Design a protein around this ligand. Structure first.
Ligand SMILES: CC[C@H](CO)Nc1nc(NCc2ccc(-c3ccccn3)cc2)c2ncn(C(C)C)c2n1
Lengths: 268, 299
């Protein structure tokens, strides 16, 4: 009903597609960062996932944080010892933007275990706002996933919580997911969820809402599938720990599919 | 920083920060400055500013107030806005005895709807459409101001802050205590405003959460499963409420005609799902004759 906004869902979908492009971090930014690596970014995101749990924050909040962190590191060089500080202020800002009850600064300080002073956190906040020019309403995979769920027939929440898990996983690995847009990652995450639990595919109704064929999403599907398979062996485990509990239907305990099927797109 | 802005006078305080009227010394432009202090203390930049800025940058529209600049010192934070000459209530009061010529009521509604449909089309709820937040210029334009209480929503929505909207313009679903509310809550508010321009008194000038509900019921009737499914399942709802029959609309929106009353009712529907959309309200026959008049006296 009006909570699915029947009169505006198109204008919204179009617009976020328009905005996801404009909010996309520069694809190969870590290579220009002298002191930090994609592995170090992998370590910081995981921490944020953990932070999101300690304070029962919206998954949405997590997703915006990573967006701010990514765009920040696209412009500003950051020493390893300060990476946590970027993250904290981002997590702080995304909280302020998205949470009904965002945690206080004191609490944000207290979790770095006094690596940084309150003064420093508030100052980084400002710096991040400057660097982003206050453009904090960035589209996330979540905002697309939520929209994609209304096409389900019928609505299955093992499918829902799995896609969440999968979309969340992609936040850990800059390589390769930086070359993918939120609408695309969400399209694969939803399809991969809708295959592991049910055996259905990326529904026709969405082919014409998005424009995404199962063909165009093939590159991203492969990477996701690979990441999904490699998940128990991945260094960062917080997301898997997160999605074990009854809340998200314990989807990270499920066994990923072996193959996915798929058409040879090119015919010789 | 503000070395190029001379403060003329203070104009108000509504929501976060204080607003000054200022003049750009170099360009000659008259502007409105929103100023935030810090200290604060704190906690950093307020979620309300963060929200207003981010959204208001995305939102360029003839019927949404224009944010011109952000001056971002360590100590103060300035928001530079276009200056509008007065708020709608002010205005509505000035015309307490004379009234507002239909064309004009019609124009102001149309524009507020155009503006609000843009908001929703871009996944923004204002959540504070009191007539102090609707600003008018001398050329007959009206604009949505103060997005301090705004938010960007997901599709579908989720539970957002309960403590929301000025009591008078606050939709029943929020009053009742539902876990979800959407675009319609903004429409309810414009509905109340629509009436407020017509009769120049608040439609539901309630003095508390329960009394507000009481007044809404006094005027629109006490709702049940037929008109709005599930109302009895709602949290802060009570069966011990009296049962009022719906008041025939001429009492009390007397001067309003055939079409306006159709629209008004549609704007003031109980069921959030039934309620008209802004987009759908723009097509309504009430607006077929619309023009852009100039506000009568020197405002
Ligand atoms: C939103 C409500 C706000 C809070 O008080 N008031 C208000 N009024 C404006 N202009 C109408 C107005 C109101 C009062 C005076 C005034 C003038 C002198 C002394 C006291 N008040 C002047 C203009 C105006 N323009 C732009 N913005 C903002 C920055 C977007 C405005 N915000």
């Amino acid at each position: 009903s009006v909570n699915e906004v029947p009169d505006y869902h198109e204008d919204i979908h179009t617009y976020l597609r328009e905005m996801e492009v404009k909010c996309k971090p520069k694809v190969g930014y870590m290579k220009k960062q002298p002191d930090i690596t994609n592995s170090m970014r992998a370590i910081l995101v995981d921490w944020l996932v953990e932070v999101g749990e300690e304070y029962k924050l919206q998954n949405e909040t997590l997703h915006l944080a990573v967006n701010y962190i990514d765009r920040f590191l696209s412009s500003m060089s950051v020493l390893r010892g300060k990476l946590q500080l970027v993250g904290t202020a981002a997590m702080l800002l995304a909280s302020k933007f998205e949470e009904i009850y965002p945690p206080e600064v004191a609490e944000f300080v207290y979790i770095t275990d006094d690596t940084y002073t309150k003064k420093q956190v508030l100052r980084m906040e400002h710096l991040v706002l400057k660097v982003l020019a206050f453009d904090l309403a960035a589209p996330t995979i979540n905002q697309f996933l939520t929209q994609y769920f209304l096409h389900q027939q019928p609505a299955n929440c093992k499918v829902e919580s799995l896609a969440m898990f999968l979309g969340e996983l992609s936040l850990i690995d800059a390589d390769p997911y930086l070359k993918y847009l939120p609408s695309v990652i969400a399209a694969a995450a939803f399809h991969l969820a809708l295959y592991t639990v049910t055996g259905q595919s990326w529904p026709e109704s969405l082919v014409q809402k998005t424009g995404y064929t199962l063909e165009t999403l093939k590159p991203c599907l492969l990477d996701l599938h690979q990441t999904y398979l490699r998940a128990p062996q991945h260094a960062q485990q917080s997301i898997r720990e997160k999605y074990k509990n009854s809340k998200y239907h314990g989807v990270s305990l499920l066994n990923p599919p072996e193959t996915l099927n798929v058409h040879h797109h090119h015919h010789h | 920083s503000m070395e190029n802005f001379q403060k003329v006078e203070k104009i108000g305080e509504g929501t976060y920060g204080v607003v000054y009227k200022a003049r750009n010394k170099l360009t000659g432009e008259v502007v409105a400055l929103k100023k935030i202090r810090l200290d604060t203390e704190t906690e950093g930049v307020p979620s309300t500013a963060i929200r207003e800025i981010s959204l208001l940058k995305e939102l360029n529209h003839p019927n949404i107030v224009k944010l011109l600049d952000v001056i971002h010192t360590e100590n103060k934070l300035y928001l530079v806005f276009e200056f509008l000459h007065q708020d709608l209530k002010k205005f509505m009061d000035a015309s307490a005895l004379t009234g507002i010529p239909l064309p004009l009521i019609k124009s102001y509604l149309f524009q507020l709807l155009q503006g609000l449909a843009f908001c929703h089309s871009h996944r923004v709820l204002h959540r504070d459409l009191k007539p102090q937040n609707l600003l008018i210029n001398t050329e007959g334009a009206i604009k949505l101001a103060d997005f301090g209480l705004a938010r960007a929503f997901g599709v579908p929505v989720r539970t957002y802050t309960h403590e929301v909207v000025t009591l008078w313009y606050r939709a029943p679903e929020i009053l009742l205590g539902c876990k979800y509310y959407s675009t319609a809550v903004d429409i309810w508010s414009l509905g109340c405003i629509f009436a407020e321009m017509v009769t120049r008194r608040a439609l539901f000038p309630g003095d508390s959460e329960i009394d507000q509900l009481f007044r809404i019921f006094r005027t629109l009737g006490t709702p049940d499963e037929v008109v709005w499914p599930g109302v009895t399942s709602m949290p802060d709802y009570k069966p011990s409420f009296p049962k009022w029959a719906r008041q025939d609309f001429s009492k009390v929106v007397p001067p309003l005609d055939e079409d306006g009353r159709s629209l008004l009712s549609q704007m003031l529907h109980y069921d959030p799902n039934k309620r008209i959309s802004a987009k759908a309200a723009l097509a309504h026959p009430f607006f077929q004759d619309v023009t852009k008049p100039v506000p009568h006296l020197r405002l």
